[PDB]
RNA sequence: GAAAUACCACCCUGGCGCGGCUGGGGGCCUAACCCUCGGAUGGGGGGACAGCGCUUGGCGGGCAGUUUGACUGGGGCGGU
């Protein structure tokens, strides 16, 4: 519950195979948004069930609430 | 209410837009090919077909080459 308050963000693919989560604030340092995007990269990557065959992380992006929507290459 | 609603995200059920891949089929030719003409190496009919080469799957006695056991007061049929 502690992390629920200090920083949490969970995972849960919805009906069609997708997840959503907070990985950086708006006015928040760029490098930061980067790092969190990352921690998510990882835990997600881990969750990756062994039932995957091929292009698993199909579409990975950053989009806001009411705003822009652009994919990100969590590689670089 | 099992869900909440703005406007921005991804993902599907379903139909239409367009584009790269490739599956299905319907039309005279034509120059390879075949038959060709009818008295000439030029004309004629057919022509991308089937002839034919190879690889494919399948009918398939017409053919080939084997096999279709031992016991048991014969063999076999009967038993086993």
Short mmCIF file of C-alpha atoms in Angstrom, two decimals, chain A residues 9 11 37-48:
data_model
loop_
_atom_site.label_atom_id
_atom_site.label_comp_id
_atom_site.label_asym_id
_atom_site.label_seq_id
_atom_site.Cartn_x
_atom_site.Cartn_y
_atom_site.Cartn_z
CA UNK A 9 1.28 2.11 -11.41
CA UNK A 11 -0.41 -3.67 -15.23
CA UNK A 37 8.80 4.74 -19.12
CA UNK A 38 11.70 2.30 -18.54
CA UNK A 39 10.78 0.70 -15.13
CA UNK A 40 7.49 0.00 -16.88
CA UNK A 41 9.47 -1.36 -19.93
CA UNK A 42 11.04 -3.85 -17.56
CA UNK A 43 8.28 -5.05 -15.24
CA UNK A 44 6.04 -5.31 -18.29
CA UNK A 45 8.76 -7.24 -20.21
CA UNK A 46 8.95 -9.61 -17.24
CA UNK A 47 5.17 -10.12 -17.04
CA UNK A 48 5.45 -11.13 -20.71
#
